[PDB]
Design a protein around this nucleic acid. Structure first.
Ligand code: ZN
Ligand code: ZN
Ligand code: ZN
Lengths: 244, 305, 209, 66, 114, 245, 716, 82
DNA sequence: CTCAAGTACTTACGCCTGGTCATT
RNA sequence: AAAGACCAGGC
DNA sequence: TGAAAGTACTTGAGCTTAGACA
């Protein structure tokens, strides 16, 4: 905390939805102590055994079998940082990986898949500690959240239907920070999905609710968007000191 | 001399010095008392070609290479005036020869500048190069000495590094090449550049032969050396080009005649020579003027002065 | 080019005459304000292989108080000054009986040259000036205030007035460019007059050491 | 600064040479060049050396003897 | 401009001057292999580095959902209306905010700059 | 607790450092053992020393763990069993039709001219270890063990993983060259995709791994003390639960 | 579509950001003005703002109209992601919404992206606040620890603990900083005609005297020639004072700090004595002159009859005496003030009493006071100041000045031009090119090394037309020439931007490498600019090579090294250490040329000036058409090595004033002068650190209390 | 120094006034005699203040000059700023 | 006998409140 | 109950 | 995981040159 470097202390764009932007201590620990957003979930970790077996079963090529002349055109495949091989059809591979994660057949929803298109790398992370938050999946310009899901969730009591079943339906999806890189989000469906003056049409995900970006203490602020950000931070700090 | 004397005395070897801006009086001692063992070791540069060649000269070492094989042998001959086995050693480095040659060049230069081209002008250069080769060649030192003197080559034994170990000295020579391949940087670059191009100059630089204009040079200030390496042939060829350009403009503009064009071209060449300093820039300006004349002819208007 | 070197020589000479005038040496007015054309006509235009070889650019001046001490300025033609040049210069000094002289060095000096300069303190004092340092007159800069060298009587009066010992005064290093401009040695005191926005004028005395 | 460049002791007697002293942690090494080398310079030896320094020499050195 | 590899030990070749025929040669320094030089150029250094970015632009970039796309600019090859556009996407690109367009639709992969 | 993501290749550039661009990869093996071994691959500013780089992007240099100073990247590649320059370039450069990348690799190949054998490359690396081995074979074995186990453990540790190690090292050098050419932006240190969080799980795991290793060390000490008599052994008195608790 | 022409000194991204920020700032200002113009007189935000109790106009603007653009590190919101600010935006979106501009106001409420950007801006502000800490506290402590013992002694000389003279009088005038106020000289910057019309006291009119002066005094003024002579002497002395002021105060700044407000006290005298301006006065102007002359003697800062004492007193009270004679002029008294005899006597007594009260009390600890008065604004100065021609400002600049940093972060040097270069932009560009360091690599399009065994072969097809003519004149054609060719391509835009021609490049090449290089180049007629370079060898033997391979350094790699040296060290134009030079017309009065016209007025001339990144003052001053007088540099150490120590005193004063008064805050000149003097008084540049505070010959207990403790006591 | 040739401001500085008043009040609080007549005054501070206003404080101020000399100024000799 | 080129070496940071903790 | 360490917090 | 600026130490380079005038 004694270090006068100000860059690490700043609020980075990557903190959207995962770390509370307002709630942070004031003092030598400003920006260095971060409180978690409401929807943020930390990856618990998983063995990348089924993913490797599926990838080998899904063609691809093991590094000992590459001809180095045929690796420039192909796209490298990374699992937990290890370079396991290359693939020549990124489209169907990524589509199948996402489909499997949505259906939770071989790949748990915690695992994340990243396709760096320009750099031709595909990275799959199963290690623990990754920060991730749920996001609705958008197909074309329509959500995968339909009226039946909400109707069943209103009936959540004595229905044995909960958030887990909603995840297993391929409707919501856990996306980490570096998978958020390749995603395109919308604020609300009823505003950004319907046709208007063309801004974007390739929306792949939609936020549950934009207020989920705030942390625990900052969520108690009524109308926090009408406040100066320093005042929101001050309230987030003082809320822990409120008596009750 | 002072540095080696001080370092040797600090290392134990009772050292000393012959010259140092001191005086016969301020060295007569150092020298004489060197014969009578009062001073064991004394260092000098060329001040020991005299002074009673004594008997018990145990060694002669060269911290820096000599000026030639003749010079090296005449230093090394101030030893061995007995049966004493006197292993005389030469210390060598690429940095040293580099320096020596650069100054042998500066000397040869000044000499030629205030003189003419003699056999000694290249004799010093090839003598130093012979010394470099001898310190760089592979073989018996006595054999190389005899070859330089043209005497019978002796197949000596236990008399040089070559005959002691047939691979250790070879290893040292190989490591010499492997020792170094190929605001502090400016002097390094200057030294490296000049040293490298001294190799391109090689031996017997000479080659000046400024031939005077033969009989009828049409050049104002023809006998001028303000531009180095601008021999008169280059000059009247450039004037020939200028007169060709003037004749082309005369054909393309229909002015009086070429009789005045001779003096006009002489004036143009003299002006270009005055505005120029070096041969390449002089040619650049000459053909720039020629191109301007051609452009004026292309446009159509007469080429006014 | 050569014209740039001629301009350099003219500027250096003009600054040297201004320096000599500021030291109390007798300098004619025309010498102070010499046009570039007048200088080129007097000394012969191009220095490179030309009439001004940086020798005959030497300036011989005498002090206003007495003409015996004189003062004399040197423009060595060598890019660097060695022992021989300083020795022949000192021989000329001794023959001419002059004691004070300057040296205008092109780039730098050998350290034997500096050792010889510091050798004779009482007999002849020699000050080394770089070619670049004399291309301008630092005393004319707006940041540099007016410096006046005080005689021993004025220094004694100043010390008696404020009951000050010498070491209690503010100091100015002998290597200071302004101190070198006036050729000041250790122990002298300079009177500095600078304007102020609170009093209008303020005088500071700096000891040279 | 002046005395560091004198590796030899003349003036006076004792014309023997002077070793370099290096500090390795808390240890002083009287690094002789060629005269035993790297002898551990014990503080007792340094105390003996300093005890014989005359008052005039140490005052010249800057430390008042009293 | 480029480098060529040895044909015997599969090492790197180096330019070597032929004193006799005055022809440029590439001779491996780890063996005795020598080959003739065709381009007759050794070292090329483009200070302005004005290398056309179209060669460094990959066709699959058109798959990006995060990239803006326009209907105004059609492709030159297939005349496809849909096209994805983006900026230099590179550092040390001097001063250039110009747009690079990639044609969408499969198997086209056309890249053009306006 | 925040931390850099392990096993990921990052490229950074320090202003006044000797390295113009530095690529690093903090590598840990499946969380199973050892905290982290970090390898740095960097390029040396702008300048030479009389016989080296004087042109466009200069020699690439690798920094191995437990090696006293830098080691050239091509020498490291040769120590992995790739003697010919074309194989090393193929591992480093994936498309030979790019001459800019090739020219950037050019100066690094010049330094590794002298070394052309895997054994001599290992000796070169072995002689630069924590303590130089007395004999050549000891140095070669130490360098081989370091490369096999303690250099990029996440790629592999057992035997024939040397080809995967070579591929990953080539990928690191390729990323460094891409950053030098400006084709990829330098990784920013505050990007939360590059950050991992050590929750109660990983933190207690890191604690318990070392604590249980110390418990085993104490058991071994008690056993060796108690077996010198050769009588017998009982485990229940050999285990101290106090250390873990 | 690339129609955006980059402004000089800025890249395309830089000028694009500048234009976008200009548009957004204009929009925010217009919306704020529109919102404020709609505020009713009953509105309480407007009430607080006009009252000045709390809030500002921008507060109302952000309340009602627009929050405004949000900035991080002085720039719009950066691309934390892959060329996008948030996942919700498309890549390469530089629009106001994507880069942080907030359209909504606090009353309307921010959108989630705008909310997050505002959060980032607030985080930056909070980081600045939590940083406004240890380093500025360190500045305070270091400054006072350097100044804690500086004191005004009983002879009013400011001395430290060793009794060394820091200042002869405190603040150079011996006045305390509490009682002084701002005043106008009123003699600086009027026209000569107006100056005489206001200050001459023309007695020839004989009618205006009857109206302003009493009828009895008019005959006395007119008849007696002594009165007229003394009044003319007074006017001559006032003209001399005007000349002295114009020497002291260039730029025509009449706002000065003086002990007693003469205008307010004259007005107080008017009100106390019921002075009626409509009636002629009984005050005799000669009595005014005598009263002023007598009063000037009783205002004593330096006590003594010595000529040195006389001069010190005159210098110390010079400015205030000039102002006193200006305001108490006979014509002013008779025309504007109409003071009577009793009012004038009371005014003189009050002036004397107030000036005597303003004198600094001996024993006042002015060192600690000055240090704390200089470091206190540092707690209000921008720590991470951002605000091209970037210059370090605020706390980092204060640290650079205080610590006497050898290398400033932004060392710059302003240049003023003497002749037509100041007015004409072409000569200004010429000087800029002659001052900006330009190597070969800054003007080369590309460089290639070819192999040309025969020069007439010309493996490059385009060159065959023009290489043959240089290769046909005697010699210089074949033999004794390296077959290796270094062909260099020159960028025309860079070639002509610096007004550089190929002949000068060739001259520099020849000077750098000698005649042993063959330099051939095209003409300006050619569409592309090329330059062919070869190596010349004089070795005519060329047999057996004499084993030159020892250090031959073959022509290929030799040409590569030569090309590197050319591209990195050719220094074609300008002087090294000067990265780039900015040129602009200053609209600020401090950087403009101010002259005294024929009418005596102050006119500010608009002339081109040059500002450089990187500093080399000695060579810049030596360059032609560069003003040797007004050209300064912000870095301090180089001024010490170039212009002396008093120049450092003045320049450090100016730099400290600039870093302090940039925010608009004002600090009394006495504290700045005291700090600058205590730094530049031992003869060298004494930095305010443990390296320089302990370098003084003070007591070891003084040093041990500051940052060194045990080591200092060990040494002592 | 002597009574003649005294160089110092005749005005009493704020520091001199403060210390003189404090020392006098301490003396009066130690039952020192009071020069001026007091009217029902029990606090030594205001008594000393009224003594100072009456020029009756029996204290001379020893002003040390930086050169080591000194000047003796009686309180009544100094003129109070207030 | 330098001096520039390196390597160690040293810095610090306003006051106030409280809690826990392992060792003594 | 002294002297340390760490943490959290106020201005 | 980043991270800073000035200063006190060592060390190790690095250089044409010989005769006969006071
Ligand atoms: Zn001794
Ligand atoms: Zn080969
Ligand atoms: Zn298409």
């Amino acid at each position: 905390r004694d270090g006068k470097l100000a860059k690490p202390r700043q609020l980075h764009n990557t903190l959207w939805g995962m770390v509370c932007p307002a709630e942070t201590p004031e003092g030598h620990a400003v920006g260095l102590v971060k409180n978690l957003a409401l929807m943020a979930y930390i990856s618990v970790g998983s063995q990348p055994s089924p993913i490797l077996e599926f990838l080998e079963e899904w063609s691809m090529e093991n590094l000992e079998e590459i001809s180095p002349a045929a690796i420039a055109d192909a796209t490298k495949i990374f699992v937990n940082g290890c370079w396991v091989g290359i693939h020549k059809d990124p489209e169907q591979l990524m589509n199948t990986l996402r489909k499997l994660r949505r259906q939770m057949d071989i790949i748990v929803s915690e695992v994340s898949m990243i396709r760096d298109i320009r750099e031709r790398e595909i990275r799959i992370y199963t290690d623990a500690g990754r920060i991730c938050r749920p996001l609705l999946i958008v197909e074309k310009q329509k959500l995968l959240l339909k009226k039946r899901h909400i109707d069943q969730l209103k009936e959540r009591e004595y229905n044995n239907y909960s958030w887990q079943d909603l995840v297993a339906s391929g409707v919501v999806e856990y996306i980490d920070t570096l998978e958020e890189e390749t995603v395109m989000l919308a604020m609300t469906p009823d505003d950004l999905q319907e046709k208007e003056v063309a801004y974007c049409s390739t929306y792949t995900h939609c936020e549950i609710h934009p207020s989920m970006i705030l942390g625990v203490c900052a969520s108690i602020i009524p109308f926090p968007d009408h406040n100066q950000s320093p005042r929101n931070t001050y309230q987030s700090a003082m809320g822990k000191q409120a008596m009750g | 001399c002072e540095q080696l004397a001080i370092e040797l005395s600090c290392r134990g070897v009772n050292a000393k010095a012959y010259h140092a801006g001191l005086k016969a009086s301020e060295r007569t001692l150092v020298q004489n008392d060197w014969m009578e063992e009062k001073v064991p070791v004394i260092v000098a540069t060329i001040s020991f070609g005299m002074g009673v060649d004594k008997a018990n000269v145990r060694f002669v070492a060269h911290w820096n290479i000599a000026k030639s094989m003749a010079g090296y042998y005449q230093e090394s001959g101030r030893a061995g005036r007995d049966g004493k086995p006197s292993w005389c050693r030469l210390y060598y480095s690429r940095n040293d020869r580099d320096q020596v040659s650069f100054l042998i060049r500066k000397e040869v230069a000044k000499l030629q500048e205030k003189r003419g081209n003699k056999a000694s002008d290249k004799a010093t250069i090839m003598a130093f190069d012979a010394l470099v080769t001898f310190c760089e060649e592979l073989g018996c030192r006595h054999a190389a000495i005899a070859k330089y003197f043209g005497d019978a080559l002796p197949a000596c034994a236990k008399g040089c590094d070559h005959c002691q170990n047939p691979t250790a000295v070879r290893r040292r020579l190989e490591a010499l090449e492997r020792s170094s391949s190929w605001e502090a940087h400016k002097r390094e670059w200057n030294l490296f550049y000049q040293k490298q191009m001294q190799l391109r100059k090689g031996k017997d630089p000479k080659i000046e032969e400024f031939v005077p204009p033969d009989e009828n040079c049409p050049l104002k200030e023809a006998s001028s050396r303000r531009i180095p390496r601008l021999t008169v042939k280059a000059r009247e060829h450039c004037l020939r080009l200028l007169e060709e350009a003037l004749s082309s403009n005369r054909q393309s503009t229909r002015t009086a005649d070429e009789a005045d064009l001779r003096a006009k071209a002489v004036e143009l060449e003299h002006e270009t020579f005055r505005n120029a300093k070096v041969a390449n820039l002089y040619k650049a300006s000459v053909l720039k003027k020629v191109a301007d004349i051609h452009r004026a002819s292309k446009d159509g208007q007469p080429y006014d002065m | 080019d050569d014209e740039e070197e001629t301009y350099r020589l003219w500027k250096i000479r003009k600054t040297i005459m201004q320096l000599c005038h500021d030291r109390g040496y007798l300098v004619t007015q025309d010498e102070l304000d010499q046009t570039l054309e007048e200088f080129k006509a007097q000394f012969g235009d191009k220095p490179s292989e030309g009439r001004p070889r940086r020798t005959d650019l030497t300036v011989l001046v005498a002090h206003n108080d007495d003409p015996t001490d004189q003062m004399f300025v040197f423009f060595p033609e060598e890019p660097k000054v060695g022992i021989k040049t300083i020795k022949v210069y000192c021989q000329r000094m001794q023959e001419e009986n002059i004691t004070r002289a300057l040296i205008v060095v092109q780039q730098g000096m050998t350290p034997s040259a500096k050792q010889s300069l510091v050798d004779m303190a009482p007999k002849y004092i020699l000050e080394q000036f770089l070619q670049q340092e004399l291309l301008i007159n630092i005393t004319e800069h707006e940041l540099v205030p007016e410096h006046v060298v005080m005689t021993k009587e004025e220094v004694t009066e100043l010390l008696a007035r404020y009951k000050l010992r010498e070491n209690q005064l503010p100091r100015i290093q002998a290597g200071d460019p302004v101190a070198r401009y006036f050729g000041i040695k250790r122990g002298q005191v300079v009177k500095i007059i600078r304007p102020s926005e609170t009093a209008g004028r303020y005088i500071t005395y700096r000891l040279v050491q | 600064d002046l005395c560091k460049g004198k590796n030899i002791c003349e003036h006076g007697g004792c014309g023997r040479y002077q070793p370099r002293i290096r500090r390795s942690g808390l240890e002083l090494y009287a690094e002789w060049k060629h005269v035993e080398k790297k002898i551990l310079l014990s503080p007792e030896r340094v105390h003996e050396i300093f005890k014989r320094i005359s008052d005039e020499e140490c005052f010249v050195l800057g430390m008042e003897p009293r | 401009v480029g480098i060529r590899f040895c044909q015997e030990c599969n090492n790197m070749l180096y330019p070597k001057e032929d004193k006799e025929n005055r022809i440029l040669l590439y001779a491996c320094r780890n063996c005795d292999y020598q080959q003739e030089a065709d381009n007759s150029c050794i070292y090329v250094n483009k200070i302005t580095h004005e290398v056309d970015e179209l060669t460094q632009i990959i066709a699959d970039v058109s798959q990006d959902p995060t990239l803006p796309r326009t209907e105004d600019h059609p492709c030159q090859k297939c005349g496809h209306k849909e096209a994805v556009f983006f900026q230099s996407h590179s550092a040390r690109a001097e001063d250039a905010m110009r747009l690079y367009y990639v044609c969408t639709a499969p198997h086209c992969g056309h890249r053009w700059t306006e | 607790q925040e931390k850099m993501a392990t096993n990921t290749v990052y490229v950074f550039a320090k202003k006044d450092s000797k390295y113009a661009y530095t690529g690093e990869c903090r590598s840990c093996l499946e969380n199973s053992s050892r905290p982290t071994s970090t390898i740095w691959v960097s390029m040396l500013a702008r300048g030479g020393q009389g016989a080296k780089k004087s042109a466009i992007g200069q020699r690439i240099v690798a920094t191995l763990p437990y090696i006293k100073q830098e080691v050239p990247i091509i020498i490291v590649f040769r120590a992995l069993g790739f003697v010919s320059d074309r194989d090393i370039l193929e591992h480093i450069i994936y498309d030979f039709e790019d001459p800019e990348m090739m020219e950037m690799v050019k100066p690094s190949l010049d330094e590794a001219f002298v070394i052309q054998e895997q054994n001599v490359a290992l000796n070169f690396i072995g002689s630069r270890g924590a303590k130089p081995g007395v004999t050549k074979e000891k140095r070669i074995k130490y360098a081989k063990e370091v490369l096999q186990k303690e250099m990029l453990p996440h790629v592999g540790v057992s035997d024939f993983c040397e080809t995967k190690k070579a591929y990953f090292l080539g990928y690191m050098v390729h990323r460094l060259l891409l950053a030098a050419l400006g084709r990829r932006e330098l990784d920013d240190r505050d990007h939360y995709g590059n950050k991992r969080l050590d929750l109660a799980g990983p933190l207690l795991a890191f604690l318990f791994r070392g604590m249980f290793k110390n418990l085993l060390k104490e058991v071994r000490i008690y056993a060796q003390k108690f077996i010198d008599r050769g009588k017998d052994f009982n485990l229940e008195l050999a285990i101290k639960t106090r250390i873990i608790s | 579509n690339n129609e955006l022409e980059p402004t000089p000194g800025n890249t395309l991204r830089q000028t694009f950001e500048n234009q976008v920020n200009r548009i957004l700032n204009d929009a925010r200002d217009k919306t704020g003005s529109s919102a404020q113009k709609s505020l009713s007189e009953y509105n309480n935000f407007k009430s607080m703002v006009v009252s000045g109790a709390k809030g500002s106009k921008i507060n109302i603007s952000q309340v009602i109209a627009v929050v405004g653009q949000q900035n991080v590190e002085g720039k719009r919101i950066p691309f934390g992601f892959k060329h996008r600010t948030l996942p919700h935006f498309i890549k390469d979106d530089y629009g106001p919404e994507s880069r942080g501009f907030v359209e909504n106001s606090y009353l309307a409420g921010l959108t989630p992206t705008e909310f997050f950007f505002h959060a980032m801006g607030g985080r930056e502000g909070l980081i600045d606040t939590a940083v406004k800490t240890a380093e500025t506290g360190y500045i305070q402590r270091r400054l006072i620890k350097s100044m804690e013992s500086v004191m005004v002694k009983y002879d009013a000389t400011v001395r430290n603990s060793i009794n060394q003279v820091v200042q002869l009088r405190y603040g150079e005038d011996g006045l305390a900083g509490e009682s002084v106020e701002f005043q106008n000289l009123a003699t600086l910057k009027p026209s000569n005609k107006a100056f005489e019309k206001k200050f001459r006291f023309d007695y020839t009119n004989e009618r205006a005297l009857r109206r302003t002066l009493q009828e009895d005094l008019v005959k006395d003024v007119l008849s007696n020639a002594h009165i007229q002579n003394e009044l003319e002497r007074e006017f001559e002395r006032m003209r001399e004072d005007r000349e002295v002021l114009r020497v002291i105060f260039p730029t025509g700044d009449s706002k000065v700090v003086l002990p007693c407000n003469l205008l307010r006290m004259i007005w107080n005298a008017q009100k106390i004595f019921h002075i009626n301006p409509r009636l002629p006065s009984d005050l005799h102007p000669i009595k005014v002159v005598e009263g002023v002359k007598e009063l000037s003697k009783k205002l004593v800062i330096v006590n003594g009859d010595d000529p040195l004492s006389r001069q010190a007193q005159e210098n110390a009270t010079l400015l205030f005496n000039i102002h006193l004679r200006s305001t108490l002029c006979s014509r002013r008294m008779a025309e504007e003030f109409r003071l009577s005899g009793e009012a004038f006597d009371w005014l003189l007594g009050e002036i004397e009493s107030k000036f005597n009260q303003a004198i600094a009390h001996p024993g006042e600890m002015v060192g600690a006071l000055a240090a704390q008065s200089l470091g206190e604004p540092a707690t209000q100065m921008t720590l991470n100041t951002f605000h091209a021609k970037n210059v370090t400002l605020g706390v980092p600049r204060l640290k650079e000045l205080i610590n006497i940093s050898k290398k400033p972060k932004t060392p710059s040097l302003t240049v003023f031009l003497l002749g037509q270069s100041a007015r004409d932009a072409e000569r200004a560009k010429d000087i800029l090119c002659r001052l900006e360091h330009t190597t070969l690599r800054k003007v080369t399009a590309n460089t290639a090394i070819y192999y040309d065994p025969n020069p007439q072969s010309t493996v490059v097809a385009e060159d065959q037309e023009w290489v043959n003519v240089y290769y046909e004149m005697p010699d210089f054609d074949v033999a004794r020439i390296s077959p290796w060719l270094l062909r260099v391509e020159l960028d025309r835009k860079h070639m002509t931007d610096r007004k550089l021609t190929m002949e000068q490049i060739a001259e520099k090449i020849n000077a750098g490498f000698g005649d042993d290089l063959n330099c051939i180049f095209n003409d300006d007629n050619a569409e592309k600019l090329v330059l062919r370079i070869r190596i010349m060898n004089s070795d005519e033997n060329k047999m057996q090579e004499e084993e030159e391979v020892v250090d031959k350094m073959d022509d290929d790699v030799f040409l590569r090294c030569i090309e590197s040296n050319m591209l990195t060290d050719m220094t074609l134009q300008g002087i090294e250490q000067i990265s780039k030079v900015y040129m602009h017309l200053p609209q600020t009065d401090n950087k403009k040329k101010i002259i005294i016209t024929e009418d005596g007025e102050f006119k500010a001339l608009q002339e081109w000036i040059l500002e450089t990144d990187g500093v080399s003052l000695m060579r810049v001053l030596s360059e032609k058409d560069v003003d040797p007088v007004r050209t300064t540099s912000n870095d301090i150490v180089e001024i010490f090595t170039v212009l002396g120590i008093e120049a450092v005193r003045k320049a450090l004063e100016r730099e400290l004033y600039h870093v302090i008064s940039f925010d608009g805050s004002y600090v009394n000149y006495r504290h700045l002068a005291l700090l600058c003097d205590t730094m530049t008084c031992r003869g060298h540049l004494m930095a305010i650190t443990r390296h320089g505070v302990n370098r003084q010959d003070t007591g070891p207990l003084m040093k041990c209390s500051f940052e060194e403790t045990v080591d200092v006591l060990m040494e002592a | 120094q002597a009574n003649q040739k005294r160089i110092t401001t005749p005005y009493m500085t704020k520091y001199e006034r403060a210390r003189v008043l404090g020392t006098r009040a301490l003396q009066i609080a130690m039952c020192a005699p009071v020069m001026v007549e007091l009217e029902g005054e029990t606090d030594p501070l205001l008594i000393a203040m009224k003594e100072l206003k009456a020029r009756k404080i029996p204290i001379i101020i020893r002003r040390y000059l930086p050169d080591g000399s000194y000047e003796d100024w009686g309180v009544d000799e100094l003129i109070i700023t207030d």
